[PDB]
Amino acid sequence: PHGSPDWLKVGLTLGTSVFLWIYLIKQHKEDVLEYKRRNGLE
Amino acid sequence: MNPIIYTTLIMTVMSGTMLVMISSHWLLIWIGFEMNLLAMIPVLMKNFNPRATEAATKYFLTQATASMMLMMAIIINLLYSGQWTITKMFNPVAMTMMTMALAMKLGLSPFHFWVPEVTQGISLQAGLLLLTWQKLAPLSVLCQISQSINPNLMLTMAMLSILIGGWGGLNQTQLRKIMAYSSIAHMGWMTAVLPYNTTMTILNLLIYITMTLAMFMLLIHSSATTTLSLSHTWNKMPVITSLMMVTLLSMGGLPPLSGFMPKWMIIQEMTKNESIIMPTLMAMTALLNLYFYMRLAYSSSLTMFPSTNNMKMKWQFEHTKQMKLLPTMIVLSTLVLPMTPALSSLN
Amino acid sequence: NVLQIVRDHWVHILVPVGFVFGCYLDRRSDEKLTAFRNKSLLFKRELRPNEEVTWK
Amino acid sequence: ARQWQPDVEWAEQFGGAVMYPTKETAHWKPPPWNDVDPPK
Amino acid sequence: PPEPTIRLQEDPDPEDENLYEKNPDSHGYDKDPIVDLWNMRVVFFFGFSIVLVLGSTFVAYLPDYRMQEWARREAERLVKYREANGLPLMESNCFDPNKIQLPEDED
Amino acid sequence: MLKIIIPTTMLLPMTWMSKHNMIWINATVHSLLISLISLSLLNQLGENSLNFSLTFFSDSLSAPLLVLTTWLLPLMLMASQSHLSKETTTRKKLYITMLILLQLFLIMTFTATELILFYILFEATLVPTLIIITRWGNQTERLNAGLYFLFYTLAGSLPLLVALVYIQNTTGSLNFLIIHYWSHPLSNSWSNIFMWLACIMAFMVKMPLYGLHLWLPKAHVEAPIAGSMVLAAVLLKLGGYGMMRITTILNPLTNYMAYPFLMLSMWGMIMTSSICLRQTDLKSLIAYSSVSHMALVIVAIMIQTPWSFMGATALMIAHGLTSSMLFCLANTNYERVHSRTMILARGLQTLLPLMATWWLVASLTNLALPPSINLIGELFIITASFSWSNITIILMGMNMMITALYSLYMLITTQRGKYTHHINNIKPSFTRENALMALHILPLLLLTLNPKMILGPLY
Amino acid sequence: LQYGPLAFVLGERTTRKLTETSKVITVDGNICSGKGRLAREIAEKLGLRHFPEAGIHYADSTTGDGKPLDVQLSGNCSLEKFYDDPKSNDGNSYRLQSWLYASRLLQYADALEHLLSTGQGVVLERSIYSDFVFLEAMYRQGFIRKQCVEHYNEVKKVTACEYLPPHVVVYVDVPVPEIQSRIQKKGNPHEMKITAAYLQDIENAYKKTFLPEMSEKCEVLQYSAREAEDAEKVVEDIEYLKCDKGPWPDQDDRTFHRLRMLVQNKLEVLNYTTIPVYLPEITIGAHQSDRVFQKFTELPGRKYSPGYNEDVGDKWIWLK
Amino acid sequence: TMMSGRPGRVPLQFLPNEARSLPPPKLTDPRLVYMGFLGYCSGLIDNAIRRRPVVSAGLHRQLLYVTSFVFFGYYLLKRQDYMYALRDHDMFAYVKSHPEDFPEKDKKTYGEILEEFHPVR
Amino acid sequence: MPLVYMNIIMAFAIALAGLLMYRSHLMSSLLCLEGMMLSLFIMSTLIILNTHFTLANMMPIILLVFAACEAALGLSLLVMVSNTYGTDYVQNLNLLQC
């Protein structure tokens, strides 16, 4: 109809994407360190 | 009906299925099937008209008969071994009664006759639920006791289902009957691999459910239940017809589409067991399904049919309700062939 | 005019960038098939005084 | 000069209750547009 | 018969358009003269000038990776050796018989 | 091999983000550049192959087909520019998308180190062609044609798939290299006979074999010009490539199993050549001529000698170019007359002389005039067949005579005689059409200078 | 929060909004009668909302901008041609009748939506009911075929079986000769060509098929030309009578929720106006359909959804 | 290979602890890139169905689709790799513990094996 | 396996066959289902009491309860179908055809 960009929904969407990406990066780093520690690489 | 009542009934259907899939006692599995049957009827009869009432009555009769046969098999198996746990059947007569009951619940041939009838009687949303969610519980029970099934009987019913779906879909102008016969053929494809690999059964179920969800949501969006009604869709929303055509190509098993993944894998699995003739007949029979999918694709997007004058008014309006999961369903039912080895996730 | 034809002729650059990316990907995929480098019976060779790998 | 597109007589092939009409199924009538029948 | 003898409301089939009418020097590519001329120019430059000439020259001068000259030089030196040493040119056995262990029949 | 695949994929975003009046120019320029890039796969080895990775490899059988496939797309764009002028921008972009997708599938099909990957892409090519035929075809029969073109193919292709997976259960691999190095003789058994048939019939139906050739005149007559071009130039050669690849595991059973197919081909080439003599449709005539040439290619592959394979490669390339040119000439006539009947527009040499020269050159190269590569392939196959049996020379000579007859009949009917009086809409030929014909014909006469580039891996 | 099941679950019930004044009213009468003035007076006096009679471009007034669109893109019919050549070879008469019925259906859905959403009553001219009377006349004068009226009957059944009829039906009774006098005194050259037989058929099929049928499910107030001038007595008559015979007293919250989901979604309202039944007067060829649809899409604010059209002036597109 | 009853299997555990002994998929894994591409296609189709400018309608929505597809694809790839590692582990252990069923065949060269020759004529 | 169990199973088979003929009277279909559950109850009770499996003394009750609930639903459906035609004849449900 006649609507402005819903800044609430936009903020939630951007925040969800940023949180998911940050969580994925942290998970990958934890996985790499755990694999190296458990297999005696570094 | 009241939206709260509708939500409660849907959650009761889902809770019955979950009770079937989480329990280890035959009585609790029977109770889950009973709960699912009980809460399913008003959902089919949501849009009150004599057709829906007739469909609900046919569905109730078939499913109650199947439940009675299931309880009979449970009692015979208990008689020949004092066991209530879902594992082995312990009797040839109890296993045959059980396979018959689960085939009637699934709609496998020769117990397929109710599927087109009920699907034509009910609306598109009820048909979506009926053809997607109602297969999870009988197939889970079959996956649990697959090592007991006589492969001859299961393979006979699977081949019969594939043949019947292929031949019965060729004669249909109604879209809901086409969906019902497609469901019958896909059930046949699923149950032909249970004796060998239940992982392939689950993979086929997932792919079929994705394609069926996309197809039903496209049919609801362009609210057509007839071939000629679907022929008018291009003059309002051609992109919907294009997506429908690609989805029908996927449903026919044409590579490199997603629908090619199950059959391929199934064929592959069946060749590891020195089974050659049956997969060949299965593929040659699935050609019929592809043929009537192509007829629908011709009628929908590849050619432009005559329209009516009043359609111009429809050009001025947009859908009030939109489906959140339709794009994901389309992409998943069309473009996941490169991700095939992920089936080792034992989906 | 710069910053105007770019918005109009930007599409042309894509085919060449795809070619460069494909060349890089071909080299990258090549880098993982070096199990027999300088190990075949036919071309088993002694390294030069300032050579590390016989091919890349 | 113009690509062929289906006309009314072509589209009417797909308007029956079933494909491939026969003598036994000739009397069959397509279902109502809304899935509601007269109560008589 | 009150019917109009008309099956439906349809556009009449149009007559095909001539590109030479609104534009002599039309090159048959597009109805816009500038786009037409530049489409001609790019087709001719990238098809005849670049691919057809430079590609043909590139194929003509492709290095001898099929090893025809190498094969002829190897054969020349091999013939030179065998003629001088009295050897019977090419041999009938492709592999040395001493490194073949035949199965005894003893029948 | 990704240096060719990635630009072809980038052709799609470049097409869809192009201006409404810049799609043809950009597509043509970048397709020509991709052809130039692909031209550097002709540097082949006398050793094994160009094994780029675990997924893609190049061969001197693959490289000429790849170069032809890349070169065909710009010509198809030029040919399609005319009859799609009154079309919406979105649908023109969709047509170009279909063409690009078909090129991508063909390029990946021809490299495809795996037999299952080859099968998947070999069947993926079936979808864009079907859409092109059934969507942008003019007549009402296009739908029917599509149905034929589909089911025939699948009728042969589903058994192959079964056989394929079966082989991997016994051999353990479907990689061409391991398959070739670890090949073992195929016993003379019923199971092996049916495995042989499953392996062969999929490629046999696509050549097409004489018995199974009915889909081809339908599909070619019904398809638009670009569809006809790609069907005659590249899609028919998928069967030949597949047979040459797969016959390595079918020995020695090929000696016995080849007899029915050899007889079908040697008699059906005569049959289809004679059919061409009584044909009222240009496109149908060119389609039947294609059937005859592919019958000769089938004979070559079944004989399975070095000269047979060299001749088959040369003939496949030469026929692709020649048949594409012939379809383009017929389409230039059709876009003026709108009839597609040979007897209608007559005496066109008096009205369009340069196009008459193009017609003459195309007819001469279809006629296998030496030293064209058409005759190089023809002669190599004929010599191999003569060594196979000296009585084949009768059928080969009859085929040559009938081929000359219908080629010159098609030339004389359309170009010679008196012009039809009531046809007054015949305009001078456009620069686009003349350039299209030249870009078809100059590569053939250049290839006759370096024949070893198209003689395959047994050269 | 657009209306739906969630709003109904949380607080939204339409029975609390009804204050015995909703009472949807529909005024009728002949072609040239003072039904519009009487309807407007009723709407002003009762405090209800007036809906001017639906025309060729009624749907144009509720979509995009309210400005009407071109005739070839909206309706593809004209009343002036129907008056000039009622027996035209292109089937303008039945195309006009069907488009007008679809407009009536859209306007009735809009009125029902307004009443069920706000509780305020509405006043209408000719509704989906009594729209057939013109059709009947067109059949008896020979302007349309019997297949046309059969297709009209099918569409009318499958569409009008879904709505609640008006509480009050108001009819203005004016005889044919004085209507004709009004027509000549009007001055419209196309309006001049109406015969007396056409008006007589309209009135006869009007008070011989529409009055008894609404008498059994609605409350009808017949008025003459003289006694329709004074709206005070009409308002008094409307207020005095109480509706307890129709379907309205049997409605409740869940039936109202169903109807409110129905009256929204104008696409689902108009679903059966384009049923695949091929009458030459209304079926349109594939080529013309494609051309006209492409022309409609190229309209300024019609390529995308209402809020996503840059040329009209919609901003912030990339964040919506 | 039915591993449903494999001993020491926690019932509803998506990724067991021992799966942490395996190298995680790289963030630039081609399969992760394909999952992101699938999310992008879903965003484009979402824009197209709702009649919005397909390429540039909602950037937040397309970003969310891509991100969610990448997230689920990463975890799915981990589970896939773990299951294949279990299959190989079990197969090698079974071959080790059953030496009589997988014998060491004698090494024979082609110079001492007689293969039938079939001339092509 | 005694003769009593076979007699009960044959009663179950007869009830199922009766449900399968469909002469008329969907009412009779519901009767056949109820006879089937009666035979099920009897035979399960006999098996459970014979083996002294104390806890499964629950399940006949349970079975009974659930079956009767089903019957109620079925009866309701019957009424509505009859409410359309005035009779419960099986052959009246011929509107939907395969």
Ligand SMILES: CCCCCCCCCCCCCCCCCC(=O)OC[C@H](COP(=O)([O-])OCC(O)COP(=O)([O-])OC[C@@H](COC(=O)CCCCCCCCCCCCCCCCC)OC(=O)CCCCCCCCCCCCCCCCC)OC(=O)CCCCCCCCCCCCCCCCC
């Ligand atoms: C092999 C794998 C590799 C390739 C992958 C291929 C798949 C990828 C994409 C998958 C799907 C996603 C997109 C589909 C959404 C559809 C949207 C659409 O309609 O298009 C309009 C839209 C523009 O038009 P618009 O003004 O916005 O609105 C017009 C309306 O949308 C509607 O317009 P309209 O109403 O005016 O016209 C109506 C039209 C509209 O109907 C359609 O447009 C059809 C849409 C396609 C169906 C999608 C199905 C789902 C996926 C199937 C994939 C199949 C592949 C398998 C092989 C089988 C081949 C079929 O329908 C018809 O005309 C009916 C007749 C059609 C003939 C029969 C139908 C055949 C369709 C088959 C198409 C298959 C390929 C599609 C490619 C994408 C096309 C946009 O097109 C686009 O711009 C989208 C294209 C993608 C944008 C790319 C942006 C990236 C560029 C910059 C980055 C550079 C990259 C590299 C980075 C580094 C560089 C430095």
Ligand SMILES: CCCCCCCCCCCCCCCCC[C@@H](O)O[C@H](CO[C@H](O)CCCCCCCCCCCCCCC)COP(=O)(O)OCC[N+](C)(C)C
């Ligand atoms: C068809 C395309 C894919 C669609 C799938 C739906 C996508 C959305 C699902 C979102 C994530 C769901 C995962 C649930 C979180 C934890 C699940 C965990 O607790 O359960 C595990 C189970 O994990 C799941 O089974 C794996 C789900 C992964 C499904 C994807 C594979 C599809 C095949 C590849 C096609 C490409 C699709 C990729 C794009 C989506 C353990 O199950 P277990 O109690 O031990 O055994 C019971 C099942 N048995 C009997 C079959 C063995």
Ligand SMILES: CCCCCCCCCCCCCCCCC[C@@H](O)O[C@H](CO[C@H](O)CCCCCCCCCCCCCCC)COP(=O)(O)OCC[N+](C)(C)C
């Ligand atoms: C109008 C009349 C003409 C006017 C002009 C008069 C002059 C005419 C003279 C030209 C024709 C006469 C023939 C004379 C031939 C001379 C050139 C020839 O000798 O070169 C050939 C070379 O030609 C090329 O090999 C063949 C052309 C390449 C073909 C590629 C096609 C272009 C790509 C476009 C895509 C097409 C797709 C086709 C699918 C495969 C053979 O060379 P070669 O003896 O070996 O060794 C070269 C030198 N070395 C020793 C250093 C290596």
Ligand SMILES: CCCCCCCCCCCCCCCCC[C@@H](O)O[C@H](CO[C@H](O)CCCCCCCCCCCCCCC)COP(=O)(O)OCC[N+](C)(C)C
């Ligand atoms: C239709 C358009 C073209 C389609 C493609 C046509 C090409 C397919 C033709 C198939 C090739 C031949 C099939 C089998 C060839 C083997 C030779 C055998 O048939 O002949 C004799 C076999 O004798 C008899 O022929 C037995 C078979 C008789 C039954 C076959 C039906 C005959 C006509 C049917 C033709 C229909 C073909 C199409 C079916 C849809 C040999 O005697 P014998 O030494 O004992 O057998 C040696 C082989 N062994 C060792 C494996 C046992």
Ligand SMILES: Nc1ncnc2c1ncn2[C@@H]1O[C@H](COP(=O)(O)OP(=O)(O)O)[C@@H](O)[C@H]1O
């Ligand atoms: N269903 C219909 N069919 C044909 N014409 C109609 C229809 N409805 C309204 N009209 C035309 O609309 C015009 C205005 O309607 P009318 O009530 O007669 O005038 P007024 O606006 O003064 O009340 C009239 O010429 C009438 O014929």
